[PDB]
Amino acid sequence: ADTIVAVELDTYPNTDIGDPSYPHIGIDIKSVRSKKTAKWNMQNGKVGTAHIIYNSVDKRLSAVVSYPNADSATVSYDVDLDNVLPEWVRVGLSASTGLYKETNTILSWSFTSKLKSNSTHETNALHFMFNQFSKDQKDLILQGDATTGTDGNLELTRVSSNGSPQGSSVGRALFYAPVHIWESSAVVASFEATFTFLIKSPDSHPADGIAFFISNIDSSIPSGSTGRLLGLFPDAN
Amino acid sequence: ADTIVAVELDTYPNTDIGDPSYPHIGIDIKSVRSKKTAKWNMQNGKVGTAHIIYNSVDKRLSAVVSYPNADSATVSYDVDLDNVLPEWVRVGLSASTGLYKETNTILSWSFTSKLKSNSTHETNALHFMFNQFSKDQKDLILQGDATTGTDGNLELTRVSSNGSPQGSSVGRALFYAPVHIWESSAVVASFEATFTFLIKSPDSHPADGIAFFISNIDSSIPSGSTGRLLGLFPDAN
Amino acid sequence: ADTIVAVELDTYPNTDIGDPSYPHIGIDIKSVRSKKTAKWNMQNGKVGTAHIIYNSVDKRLSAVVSYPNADSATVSYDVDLDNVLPEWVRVGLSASTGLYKETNTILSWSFTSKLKSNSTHETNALHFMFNQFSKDQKDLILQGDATTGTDGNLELTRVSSNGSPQGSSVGRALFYAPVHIWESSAVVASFEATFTFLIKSPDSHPADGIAFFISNIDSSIPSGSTGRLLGLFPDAN
Amino acid sequence: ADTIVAVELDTYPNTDIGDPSYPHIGIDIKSVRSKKTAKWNMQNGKVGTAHIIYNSVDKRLSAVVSYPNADSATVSYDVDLDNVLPEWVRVGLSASTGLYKETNTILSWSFTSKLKSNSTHETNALHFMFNQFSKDQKDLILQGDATTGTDGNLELTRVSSNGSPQGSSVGRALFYAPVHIWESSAVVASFEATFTFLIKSPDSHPADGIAFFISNIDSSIPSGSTGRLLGLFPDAN
């Protein structure tokens, strides 16, 4: 079983597995049942922005999602990620559709991790930034339905030629390089992630959402993780 | 008077103004009487490192002080710096000596500020890094006894040719450029400050310490601020 | 007088002071008479981008100007900026109007300077980024008609409420902080400047242009520098 | 046959294949026979620093190597790398020993690549930094004799337990992630690489050197590329 830490942008209320009634953002530690959620007024057809942040000093994982000219949704959770994740991980974006559907379009993605040592008092750092995605993006591991190059975007879930999202769809993009996320010898470990997204539905009911996630480096899409499981979890436990 | 937010590396217990019995790190919000302290095993004559981090999501000022192959002292305080600081500030380093004395030597200093905005959705940023200080450092405002250029270091307080620190000394260094520290239109404001320092005392009693501080742009050394007030405060209220 | 190094986006051929017959980009070293120019197909009313890059290894000032879906204009000049500029400078943007007029609108501006040193072997750096300008931007020195805050843009030259650019206007914006541009103890000095701009003229004859410039720290708009001198030079020598 | 672009730190004069009489730095475009060389006073047992830089505007590949308190060696060569390398590459460090030997110790390595588009006018960027290396460094592809974790360094060539370098040795470290080094749609492509190194010999004759290199992503150590071929080339052509 993969080890997963995620921020979910959850557009569809699965009230039988702990979702609230409304679209929401959440912090998932090893379960689709968010440890903490906040209400989120997803805006259909509009470009949004997620900022995620962590440091080893506060051990607080925080996410902010916003649209131009709207109040933000933010959620926070105290978690020592040295006790949850392995030392080496991969970072990625995940999305799914079920019975109901939406485009899961990423327009940009950027990430920064830092280790600042006690042993030496010197820093190890990874930073990547995509504002365009190309038809053949060799620093990305695309899983399931995920594709790149259509209008320089990353389409996480399946979309027809006229541009209609398909249901029962799942897809993920991971950064090729493993990331050293925590280290005993570090005085401060920090990571930042930012992405922009276009979730468009023809339905008045979009599903299922987008997640930024951290996994074991060999993470793959769990079997039957379309719909409410967001390509992250094998089950709703 | 000046408006001050500070992290103090305080080497001298002034127990009649709320100091603990031991050298401590402290978060000061408009008062030398730290809202929060932690024990700090300052190591006479060694190069130490200070990391300060704030973000407008967690609203939590944190400091970590460390030497090679020792435990860290860390201290944190929940505070909304929108309700304490004016929108525009200067950042600096202050130090002091009283009856008792120490080198207050700064070997390097870096600082990073970001506003990432709502309604606009476009980031403003400032970052500077000093790994050596020159004899005439025109992007630093030197106050009091603060000098630059000797071993390419910043000496906050007065030192002899023969290496001896003087008492009743006080000095500060401010980054020339004002800093946009918070904005009501920003979804995430954050900042990071790192400095390395060498505190050496010929006595078994070093005084008084070093602080990173954020002030009103026209901040100057208050009268009588030598020793226990660290160049930061006019009195001990 | 002031010491000036500049890249000019020059929209008006002043053929009696060495200008080519066409709108051009130019590298100016202590003279409005560009040491080097290239043809530039300035696009009335579009957002353009300017990239300037220098390094003390190649000793080569290069500029690239581009619009979406057009060819770049690029210009380069071998010059040792240790023999032209004082050790400490300010960086800025200048613009001008004469008989003829244009918006000189700056939408964003970023700058990066590094000294990486010998005998010391430790890097000094400054970086600032403006993706929006506020009504009161305390890290910019505004000279002449330069204003900020309207559409969160920097208007170098005078514009009406009704959107109309005025003639015989001149304006500049300088980064507040002085910049350590070269050091004799550095193995590699380098810098990078990026700005996006919108030049709109109601006539089929726009004038006069925008420049990124590096000056002595106390640089001010020379007398009579409107129109063809671009706020940079007192005369056309 | 791999496609290779390298900066060599060449400690041993192979005068039969175009080496000068003395230790030297060089730019290798698809041949061990440097297109351009400069004299280099390698300092045995001392920590050195290499800075490599390129941009698509100058199409000039430049390298600077220096020690504390010594004059630098620099070399430059005009090369359009869009005409030499594939669009996607891996970056790495390479070193070899032959009949004669040296430690090929890397203490730190950092890299930055940038693409800034015409199609969009938005940037794609990779930056990594190692100041420590760990016993198990999963963002590095180690080939041949290369090992990590001994004193937090990367040993490129084989060294005994007492710390004696072995001859007929070859080794390479590549960044796990493929790098998008050039792109038609880019107005400026730039890359920076920096590393620090300790070359120590017991001999008064060290060999064979260190190289920073760019290759096709599947690059491997050519057969018999110990000695003068630096783990880069199958032959001296």
Ligand SMILES: O=C(NCCO[C@H]1O[C@H](CO)[C@@H](O)[C@H](O)[C@@H]1O)c1ccc(-c2cccc(-c3ccc(C(=O)NCCO[C@H]4O[C@H](CO)[C@@H](O)[C@H](O)[C@@H]4O)cc3)c2)cc1
């Ligand atoms: O009937 C049951 N459970 C069985 C009976 O269990 C009790 O009695 C037993 C016998 O005595 C005993 O053994 C046991 O312990 C119990 O005492 C049952 C049925 C429904 C629910 C339920 C509760 C609350 C909410 C829901 C719910 C279901 C479905 C949705 C929904 O929106 N469905 C559409 C989703 O379809 C797909 O598409 C979306 C969007 O694309 C995806 O998210 C999704 O993954 C799908 O692909 C909402 C709410 C049901 C409880 C118990």
Ligand SMILES: O=C(NCCO[C@H]1O[C@H](CO)[C@@H](O)[C@H](O)[C@@H]1O)c1ccc(-c2cccc(-c3ccc(C(=O)NCCO[C@H]4O[C@H](CO)[C@@H](O)[C@H](O)[C@@H]4O)cc3)c2)cc1
């Ligand atoms: O004798 C020849 N060539 C054959 C004769 O060729 C001529 O005549 C033929 C018959 O008529 C005709 O067919 C042909 O066309 C010719 O007209 C020959 C021998 C030597 C050289 C030569 C020239 C200049 C310099 C050198 C040279 C050799 C070796 C070194 C050196 O330093 N050697 C030690 C290196 O050993 C190892 O270790 C180092 C350091 O670790 C590594 O770098 C190296 O890889 C090894 O592992 C220096 C200089 C020889 C030309 C022609």
Ligand SMILES: [Ca+2]
């Ligand atoms: Ca859900």
Ligand SMILES: [Ca+2]
């Ligand atoms: Ca005290």
Ligand SMILES: [Ca+2]
């Ligand atoms: Ca002109």
Ligand SMILES: [Ca+2]
């Ligand atoms: Ca050689």
Ligand SMILES: [Mn+2]
């Ligand atoms: Mn949910």
Ligand SMILES: [Mn+2]
């Ligand atoms: Mn105190």
Ligand SMILES: [Mn+2]
């Ligand atoms: Mn001109």
Ligand SMILES: [Mn+2]
């Ligand atoms: Mn050579």
